[PDB]
């Protein structure tokens, strides 16, 4: 979910902490329903792409000598 400071910029207003919670509780209540495509583009506007770069280790290339 977007952070309170990211909601405070989409809306361009100042928000309380409880204001942010009530909005999130209302979006969660919308996912549990049989939301269609129109109700899915809207929720994704408030879902940020978490920096889920995998913890998978990067493998060095296998080189060959003379």
């Amino acid at each position: 979910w977007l952070i309170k400071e990211e909601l405070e910029e989409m809306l361009v207003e100042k928000l309380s902490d409880l204001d942010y919670m009530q909005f999130i509780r209302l979006l969660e209540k919308l996912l549990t329903s049989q939301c269609g495509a129109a109700e899915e583009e809207f929720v994704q506007r408030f879902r940020r792409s978490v920096t889920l770069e995998s913890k998978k280790q990067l493998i060095e290339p296998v080189q060959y000598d003379e």
Binding site: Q22, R25, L26, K29
Partner: protein, 86 residues
């Protein structure tokens, strides 16, 4: 003294369970007010003090019964929020 014995304040033991028989007897004496009456009778309570306590007790019961009634009445609306989001 002049009454028949083994009728008043007498509980029979079931299956040798004396702990449950003693608890039943203790519960009987408590509900009938004897346990608390024996304790208050160890020392003399002065009449002005007895009236003060009997009046305090009477008013705490009325106040506790009235506060329970209020909580029960106002707990009907403890259901989930019907208009969430508004």
């Amino acid at each position: 003294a002049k009454h028949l014995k083994f009728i008043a304040r007498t509980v029979m033991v079931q299956e040798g369970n004396v702990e449950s028989a003693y608890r039943t007897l203790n519960r009987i004496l408590t509900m009938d007010g004897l346990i608390e009456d024996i304790k208050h009778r160890r020392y003399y309570e002065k009449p002005c003090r007895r009236r003060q306590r009997e009046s305090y007790e009477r008013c705490r019961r009325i106040y506790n019964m009235e506060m329970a009634r209020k909580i029960n009445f106002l707990m009907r609306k403890n259901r989930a929020d019907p208009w969430q989001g508004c």
